[PDB]
CSV table of all heavy atoms in Angstrom, one decimal:
chain,number,residue,atom,x,y,z
A,141,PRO,N,29.1,-108.5,-38.7
A,141,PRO,CA,28.4,-107.7,-39.9
A,141,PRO,C,28.4,-106.2,-39.8
A,141,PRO,O,28.3,-105.6,-40.7
A,141,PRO,CB,27.0,-108.4,-39.9
A,141,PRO,CG,26.9,-109.0,-38.5
A,141,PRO,CD,28.3,-109.6,-38.2
A,142,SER,N,28.3,-105.7,-38.4
A,142,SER,CA,28.3,-104.4,-38.1
A,142,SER,C,29.6,-103.7,-38.7
A,142,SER,O,29.4,-102.5,-38.9
A,142,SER,CB,28.3,-104.1,-36.6
A,142,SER,OG,29.4,-104.2,-36.0
A,143,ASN,N,30.6,-104.3,-38.8
A,143,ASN,CA,31.9,-103.8,-39.3
A,143,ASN,C,32.5,-104.3,-40.4
A,143,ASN,O,33.3,-105.3,-40.3
A,143,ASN,CB,32.9,-103.8,-38.0
A,143,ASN,CG,34.3,-103.2,-38.2
A,143,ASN,OD1,34.6,-102.5,-39.2
A,143,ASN,ND2,35.2,-103.7,-37.4
A,144,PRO,N,32.1,-103.9,-41.6
A,144,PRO,CA,31.7,-102.6,-42.0
A,144,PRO,C,30.3,-102.7,-42.7
A,144,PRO,O,30.1,-102.1,-43.8
A,144,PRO,CB,32.7,-102.0,-42.8
A,144,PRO,CG,33.5,-103.1,-43.3
A,144,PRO,CD,33.0,-104.4,-42.8
A,145,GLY,N,29.4,-103.5,-42.3
A,145,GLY,CA,28.1,-103.7,-42.9
A,145,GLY,C,28.3,-105.0,-43.8
A,145,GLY,O,29.3,-105.4,-44.1
A,146,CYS,N,27.1,-105.6,-44.0
A,146,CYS,CA,27.1,-106.8,-44.7
A,146,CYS,C,26.0,-107.0,-45.7
A,146,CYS,O,24.8,-106.7,-45.7
A,146,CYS,CB,26.9,-108.0,-43.7
A,146,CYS,SG,27.3,-109.7,-44.3
A,147,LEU,N,26.4,-107.5,-47.0
A,147,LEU,CA,25.5,-107.6,-48.3
A,147,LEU,C,25.6,-109.2,-48.4
A,147,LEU,O,26.6,-109.8,-48.4
A,147,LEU,CB,26.0,-107.0,-49.4
A,147,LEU,CG,25.7,-105.5,-49.5
A,147,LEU,CD1,26.4,-104.7,-48.4
A,147,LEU,CD2,26.3,-105.1,-50.9
A,148,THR,N,24.4,-109.8,-48.4
A,148,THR,CA,24.1,-111.2,-48.5
A,148,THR,C,23.3,-111.6,-49.7
A,148,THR,O,22.2,-111.0,-49.7
A,148,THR,CB,23.5,-111.7,-47.3
A,148,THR,OG1,24.5,-111.5,-46.2
A,148,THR,CG2,23.4,-113.3,-47.3
A,149,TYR,N,23.7,-112.4,-50.6
A,149,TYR,CA,23.0,-112.8,-51.8
A,149,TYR,C,23.2,-114.3,-52.0
A,149,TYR,O,24.0,-114.9,-51.6
A,149,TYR,CB,23.5,-112.1,-53.0
A,149,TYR,CG,23.5,-110.5,-52.9
A,149,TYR,CD1,24.6,-109.8,-53.0
A,149,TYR,CD2,22.3,-109.9,-52.8
A,149,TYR,CE1,24.6,-108.5,-53.0
A,149,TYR,CE2,22.2,-108.5,-52.9
A,149,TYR,CZ,23.4,-107.8,-53.1
A,149,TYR,OH,23.3,-106.5,-53.1
A,150,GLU,N,22.0,-114.8,-52.8
A,150,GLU,CA,22.1,-116.1,-53.3
A,150,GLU,C,23.0,-115.9,-54.7
A,150,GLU,O,22.6,-114.9,-55.4
A,150,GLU,CB,20.6,-116.3,-53.8
A,150,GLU,CG,20.4,-117.9,-54.0
A,150,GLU,CD,20.8,-118.4,-55.4
A,150,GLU,OE1,20.7,-117.6,-56.3
A,150,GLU,OE2,20.9,-119.6,-55.6
A,151,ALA,N,23.9,-116.8,-55.0
A,151,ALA,CA,24.9,-116.6,-56.0
A,151,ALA,C,24.4,-116.4,-57.6
A,151,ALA,O,24.8,-115.6,-58.3
A,151,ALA,CB,26.0,-117.7,-56.1
A,152,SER,N,23.3,-117.2,-57.8
A,152,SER,CA,22.8,-117.1,-59.2
A,152,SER,C,21.9,-115.8,-59.3
A,152,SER,O,22.0,-115.2,-60.3
A,152,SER,CB,21.7,-118.3,-59.3
A,152,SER,OG,22.5,-119.4,-59.5
A,153,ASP,N,21.1,-115.5,-58.3
A,153,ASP,CA,20.3,-114.3,-58.2
A,153,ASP,C,21.2,-113.0,-58.3
A,153,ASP,O,21.1,-112.1,-59.0
A,153,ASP,CB,19.6,-114.2,-56.9
A,153,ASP,CG,18.9,-112.8,-56.7
A,153,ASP,OD1,17.8,-112.5,-57.4
A,153,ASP,OD2,19.3,-112.0,-55.8
A,154,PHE,N,22.4,-113.1,-57.6
A,154,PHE,CA,23.6,-112.1,-57.6
A,154,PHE,C,23.9,-111.7,-59.0
A,154,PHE,O,24.0,-110.6,-59.6
A,154,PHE,CB,24.7,-112.6,-56.8
A,154,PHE,CG,25.9,-111.8,-56.9
A,154,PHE,CD1,25.9,-110.6,-56.3
A,154,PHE,CD2,27.1,-112.3,-57.5
A,154,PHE,CE1,27.2,-109.7,-56.4
A,154,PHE,CE2,28.3,-111.5,-57.6
A,154,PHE,CZ,28.3,-110.3,-56.9
A,155,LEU,N,24.1,-112.8,-59.9
A,155,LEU,CA,24.2,-112.7,-61.3
A,155,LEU,C,23.2,-112.3,-62.3
A,155,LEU,O,23.3,-111.3,-63.0
A,155,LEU,CB,25.0,-114.0,-61.9
A,155,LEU,CG,26.4,-114.4,-61.2
A,155,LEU,CD1,26.7,-115.8,-61.6
A,155,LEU,CD2,27.4,-113.5,-61.5
A,156,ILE,N,22.2,-113.0,-62.0
A,156,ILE,CA,20.8,-112.8,-62.9
A,156,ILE,C,20.3,-111.4,-62.8
A,156,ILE,O,20.0,-110.9,-63.7
A,156,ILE,CB,19.9,-113.9,-62.7
A,156,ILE,CG1,20.4,-115.3,-63.2
A,156,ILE,CG2,18.7,-113.7,-63.5
A,156,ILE,CD1,19.8,-116.5,-62.6
A,157,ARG,N,20.3,-110.9,-61.6
A,157,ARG,CA,19.7,-109.6,-61.4
A,157,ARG,C,20.8,-108.5,-61.0
A,157,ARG,O,20.5,-107.4,-60.8
A,157,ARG,CB,18.7,-109.5,-60.2
A,157,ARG,CG,17.4,-109.9,-60.4
A,157,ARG,CD,17.4,-111.5,-60.6
A,157,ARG,NE,15.9,-111.8,-60.7
A,157,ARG,CZ,15.4,-113.1,-60.3
A,157,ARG,NH1,16.2,-113.9,-59.5
A,157,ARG,NH2,14.2,-113.3,-60.5
A,158,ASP,N,22.1,-108.8,-61.4
A,158,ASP,CA,23.1,-107.9,-61.3
A,158,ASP,C,23.1,-107.1,-59.9
A,158,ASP,O,23.2,-105.9,-60.0
A,158,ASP,CB,23.0,-107.0,-62.6
A,158,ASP,CG,24.5,-106.4,-62.9
A,158,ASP,OD1,25.6,-107.0,-62.7
A,158,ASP,OD2,24.5,-105.1,-63.2
A,159,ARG,N,23.0,-108.0,-58.8
A,159,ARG,CA,22.8,-107.2,-57.6
A,159,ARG,C,24.1,-106.4,-57.1
A,159,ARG,O,25.2,-106.9,-57.6
A,159,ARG,CB,22.6,-108.3,-56.5
A,159,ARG,CG,21.5,-109.1,-56.6
A,159,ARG,CD,20.1,-108.5,-56.3
A,159,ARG,NE,19.0,-109.4,-56.5
A,159,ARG,CZ,17.7,-109.1,-56.5
A,159,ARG,NH1,17.4,-107.8,-56.5
A,159,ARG,NH2,16.8,-110.0,-56.6
A,160,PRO,N,23.9,-105.2,-56.6
A,160,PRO,CA,25.2,-104.4,-56.3
A,160,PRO,C,26.1,-105.0,-55.2
A,160,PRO,O,25.7,-105.6,-54.3
A,160,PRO,CB,24.6,-103.1,-55.8
A,160,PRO,CG,23.2,-103.5,-55.3
A,160,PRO,CD,22.8,-104.6,-56.2
A,161,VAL,N,27.4,-104.8,-55.5
A,161,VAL,CA,28.4,-105.0,-54.3
A,161,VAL,C,28.9,-103.7,-53.8
A,161,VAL,O,28.6,-102.7,-54.4
A,161,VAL,CB,29.7,-105.8,-54.8
A,161,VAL,CG1,29.2,-107.1,-55.6
A,161,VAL,CG2,30.5,-104.9,-55.6
A,162,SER,N,29.4,-103.7,-52.6
A,162,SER,CA,30.0,-102.7,-51.9
A,162,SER,C,31.4,-103.2,-51.6
A,162,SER,O,31.6,-103.9,-50.8
A,162,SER,CB,29.3,-102.1,-50.7
A,162,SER,OG,30.0,-101.1,-50.0
A,163,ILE,N,32.4,-102.5,-52.2
A,163,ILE,CA,33.8,-102.8,-52.0
A,163,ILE,C,34.2,-102.3,-50.5
A,163,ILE,O,35.3,-102.7,-50.1
A,163,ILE,CB,34.7,-102.1,-52.9
A,163,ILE,CG1,34.6,-100.6,-53.0
A,163,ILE,CG2,34.5,-102.7,-54.3
A,163,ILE,CD1,35.8,-99.9,-53.6
A,164,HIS,N,33.3,-101.6,-49.9
A,164,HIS,CA,33.6,-101.1,-48.4
A,164,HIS,C,32.9,-102.0,-47.3
A,164,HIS,O,33.0,-101.8,-46.1
A,164,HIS,CB,33.3,-99.6,-48.4
A,164,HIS,CG,33.9,-98.8,-49.2
A,164,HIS,ND1,33.2,-98.1,-50.2
A,164,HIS,CD2,35.1,-98.4,-49.5
A,164,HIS,CE1,34.1,-97.4,-51.0
A,164,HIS,NE2,35.1,-97.5,-50.5
A,165,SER,N,32.2,-103.0,-47.9
A,165,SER,CA,31.5,-103.8,-46.8
A,165,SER,C,31.7,-105.3,-47.0
A,165,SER,O,32.3,-105.7,-48.1
A,165,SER,CB,29.9,-103.6,-47.0
A,165,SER,OG,29.8,-102.2,-46.4
A,166,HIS,N,31.3,-106.2,-46.1
A,166,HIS,CA,31.4,-107.7,-46.3
A,166,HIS,C,30.4,-108.0,-47.4
A,166,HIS,O,29.3,-107.4,-47.6
A,166,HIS,CB,30.8,-108.4,-45.1
A,166,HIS,CG,31.6,-108.0,-43.8
A,166,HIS,ND1,32.9,-108.3,-43.7
A,166,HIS,CD2,31.2,-107.5,-42.6
A,166,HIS,CE1,33.3,-108.0,-42.4
A,166,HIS,NE2,32.1,-107.5,-41.6
A,167,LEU,N,30.8,-109.0,-48.2
A,167,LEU,CA,29.9,-109.7,-49.1
A,167,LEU,C,29.9,-111.3,-48.9
A,167,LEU,O,31.0,-111.8,-48.7
A,167,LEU,CB,30.4,-109.4,-50.7
A,167,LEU,CG,29.6,-110.1,-51.7
A,167,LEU,CD1,28.2,-109.6,-51.7
A,167,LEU,CD2,30.2,-110.0,-53.0
A,168,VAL,N,28.7,-111.7,-48.7
A,168,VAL,CA,28.5,-113.2,-48.4
A,168,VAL,C,27.6,-113.8,-49.6
A,168,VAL,O,26.5,-113.2,-49.8
A,168,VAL,CB,27.8,-113.5,-47.1
A,168,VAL,CG1,27.5,-115.0,-46.9
A,168,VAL,CG2,28.8,-112.9,-46.0
A,169,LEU,N,28.0,-114.8,-50.4
A,169,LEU,CA,27.3,-115.4,-51.3
A,169,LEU,C,27.0,-117.0,-50.9
A,169,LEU,O,28.0,-117.7,-50.7
A,169,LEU,CB,28.0,-115.3,-52.7
A,169,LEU,CG,28.4,-113.9,-53.2
A,169,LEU,CD1,29.3,-114.1,-54.4
A,169,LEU,CD2,27.2,-113.3,-53.5
């Protein structure tokens, strides 16, 4: 997760609250 940072979301919450992604970091759903 340190390289290059990690964003972790619940998939429905991700959509419903339009949670931000970072194209430069890990994304876990």
Side-chain angles (χ1 to χ4, degrees):
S142 79
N143 176 19
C146 194
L147 280 65
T148 298
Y149 300 119
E150 199 276 340
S152 295
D153 177 71
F154 174 69
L155 299 169
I156 296 160
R157 277 78 172 214
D158 202 40
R159 302 286 184 195
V161 309
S162 176
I163 61 158
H164 305 111
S165 291
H166 302 300
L167 179 62
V168 176
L169 300 176

